[model samples]
Target: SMSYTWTGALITPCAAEESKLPINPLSNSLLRHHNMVYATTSRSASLRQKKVTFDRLQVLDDHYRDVLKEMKAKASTVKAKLLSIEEACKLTPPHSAKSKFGYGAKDVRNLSSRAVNHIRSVWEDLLEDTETPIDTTIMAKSEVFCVQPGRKPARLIVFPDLGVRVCEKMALYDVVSTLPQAVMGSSYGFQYSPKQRVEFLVNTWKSKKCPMGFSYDTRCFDSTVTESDIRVEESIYQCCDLAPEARQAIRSLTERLYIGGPLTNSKGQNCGYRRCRASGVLTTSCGNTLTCYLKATAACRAAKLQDCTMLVNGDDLVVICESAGTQEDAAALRAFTEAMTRYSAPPGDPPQPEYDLELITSCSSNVSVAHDASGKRVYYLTRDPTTPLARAAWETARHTPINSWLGNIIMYAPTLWARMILMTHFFSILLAQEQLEKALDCQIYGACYSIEPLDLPQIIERLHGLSAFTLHSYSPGEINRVASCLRKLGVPPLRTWRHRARSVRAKLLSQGGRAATCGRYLFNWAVRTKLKLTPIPAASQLDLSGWFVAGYSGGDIYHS
Candidate 1:
């Protein structure tokens, strides 16, 4: 009967009418209503489930088979071994969802007989059920909330069956992690860091012989996944030639759980049917990567979009192409759309072709203006305030797996919102709690990192070059967006937040160790102090990029 704020606090009771949380900044305005997330996800799931359950769209051809053969062969050559259940379970977070097996994450970690028995049964089912699909319980679970309001009142995120989730990890986690990057090369995406990404974009933009670039978007990407898509994806998996056990296990999980699964909703409503992709699965990342890459590569040929460059993480796509005149670019985009539709990846939104590199938006990020050490303008990836704000709020209320404050400070350290608001707010909370050194852990790409206030200077300097200490006036649009988010989230203006950060900074400096370092480097903006921009010693050899794909809809315009 032990319950706490972080646990049950996010769980909202069903509302028959539009509701408001009297004073909850986290849920008010930003989150339209409870079940809003569930309803949309469930509704979409229900629609796709019908198609996959009743009428599958898998058309396996020789090409699909060949891809699988190639994948299985490569996977075979890689020297890796299956992780035992305990090893795999150990990798799971302690706060992972409780098992219906009359146990919880703590029980499994403590090596409870019941928990161990349940896991073994889950693995057995995964091994044996090749043809019959597995069942997954689904419900809206709130992880974080965004400040930007949604089209149809935003709600919580869908939760997957934890037991099956871990089981899937055991069967395919290794393959999922290593295989895609091996096969895809530069296109695999997980291989690059933020520095590499910016470098790649800048170099390509400068290197282009012609003026044409475009990014693709798929409508309801997960929902549109057909039985055929899943099958074709599996074929690519087969080419890896994994260990016989890994191979068989992968195939069985594919047919039984990956492609199709029973879905039970939060209220224990038995729902959900799919022969396509589940929103939550290990295969979700690799599967989408392969399909998108394959489709884009072939579609490039079909559309005659010449000299193509593509970077994808999952479904996010950014393609840089050499173009002719304006008329020609428009015509080519139309052809690209046609080719994509023929491949079952019809546009969720129409393609917007750009004549300038800066105009092309991809990965939910767009180029924004900043000044480097020499007071010269620089372009870097940026997006709306939603993600950082959500994370900041979560950090303010409770600890999460990630130190959202430090992570955002790393990515957007030079920006107005990040330096002005985020650092101030978070450091204040940490100072008051006397936990500045209690740097929480967060991940970038695939690596884990722990951040403390003490480490801010080096991190910021390394990331932003010299401009880490210099003030750069942001563009009008970005500045306005930041202001809007502040209002929506009910956070104070940067001016007022400054005093708080000074207190946090002063306290951190007194704590010694990393806390003092954080106080020295990170809180300068708070105290109206600035450090000279320089190289971060630690960042010289660091790689901050990983393989994840996504793209933004619309952003800053570049007339180049």
Candidate 2:
């Protein structure tokens, strides 16, 4: 019932009978006239149901056994410290999701008597009831995405109860995040920044000394997590040096809650959910990291893909391996899947791979090419343009435009979509005056931030690797995609955008505050390098060196 009528994207998805929308030439003068993009299907019901069986497949082989055995053995020898209730409450952000318990985030942070008691009561109950699995209330978020330029159905991202969410934070947040870093180092997802990710990519690619990169996607990633998988994850937690109560608490959480529990929908029906990784839990990130590492490391060893290297963020994985020619690549990939399957985590749909540094899509980012002022081709990280456009459109309609577009702009400033399309539209809107500041707080790479327009030069240089004014040309493919996207979303053509960018730049310059600086920095490509380019001022304090765990950075991850 919460899912609404299909108004998912800025432009309505092409109708089944109308795959082609009117392409307004710059000659026509860009204008808006469109319908819903679509809310459609990728797989048919039979295929979806058939895939569900694969989702249920638990083919744990000896490799899975050894890993499980090793983790359990470690857990028995370790102990973890318990965080105080006060400390846990303190960690709650001032704007965290409110509780149905009638206490909101502000109240919880303030240690309001009622909020604290309710929190404490939940905690106490969590500690006391070590056996009964707590049912999690589930919700389906309306997430619109496009696998290609075509319209895509909105994905229903199912998540769990707010109460259990808070509980996970109180109990396991520190242990899950930190322990993996301690145990796996670089393999831990949270430890890397964009700089580190680029470094690792460059280093490994250089070391491989050849071409041919393969990225693997696990079929039904979260769904593939079974009771045994959850138990194995809990066992890893058990290995930590935790307080007795903490250990027991983790175990109980693992058994009753973590391993998976019944999910109730908004309609008060047991409509769905169980025995899958709860996307909403604090443990989801750390748990997936640990499990994937254990599986990948083991599988690499089993496959014996010599001189192979990998970087993973949960299920999004990329392996930059030596070019073993086509036949060898096939065999290695086969063995890799065999090993992953044995580890109970198999590859998706029996398919896929991309070539060398020229184009590698790792962690949702594709290594793409662009052009600099010198007309030399530049390699940068990027992904399909769907997300930014869809989100930007969604934000436009809402009275409050939050940070998705801004965050994307921050991370992907050099991206064709961002630099040309998004920047022009955002500033044009903001210049006209928009009400987005009521937007909540934001964080990047774990550090909290206070966002404003002025933060651009700092964010752009840090994220993109060069000043926006320094680079301008995109590949023909990027240009085509950008143009099509603009028409689809009813955004003005490049000419109109250049006009707006100039207007925005001159306006910001007129204001002459941080707004002026932001205008010049962000729209500098639209104007010129009037404002001197400098690095992110006082940059070392924030930890956003990496983001979304993947995106384009202007400089090279493959070059020195």
Best candidate according to TM-score: 2
lDDT of 2 at 543: 51
- The candidate scoring highest on lDDT is 1
Give one digit per residue, the lDDT tens place, for model 1 in 458-510. 66666566565555666777778778767666666565667667777788778
Model 2 superposed RMSD (Cα): 7.5
lDDT agreement with native, every candidate: 0.60, 0.60
TM-score for candidate 2, residues paired by index = 0.81
Residue-by-residue lDDT tens digits, candidate 2, 1-560: 11111112221111232222233232123235324332233222223323433345556667666766665564455444566666666666565556767887678667788887776777777788988877665443343343343443332333444455556666686575457655655545456655456656766677765566677788767767777778878877877777666776787788877676665544545634466676666677677767877787667667766666667676667777777777777787788888888666778755344555636666667655666656776556566666566655555554332356776676567777787767777676666664322233334543334466556666666655653446656766667766776766566667777887788778777877667666766777776444556655544355553343321111001100
Poorest 10 consecutive residues of model 1 by lDDT? Answer: 551-560
lDDT value, residue 502 of candidate 2: 85
Per-residue error for 485 in candidate 2, Å, reads 4.0
The number of clashing residue pairs in each candidate reads 33, 18
Error of 1 at 549 (Å): 12
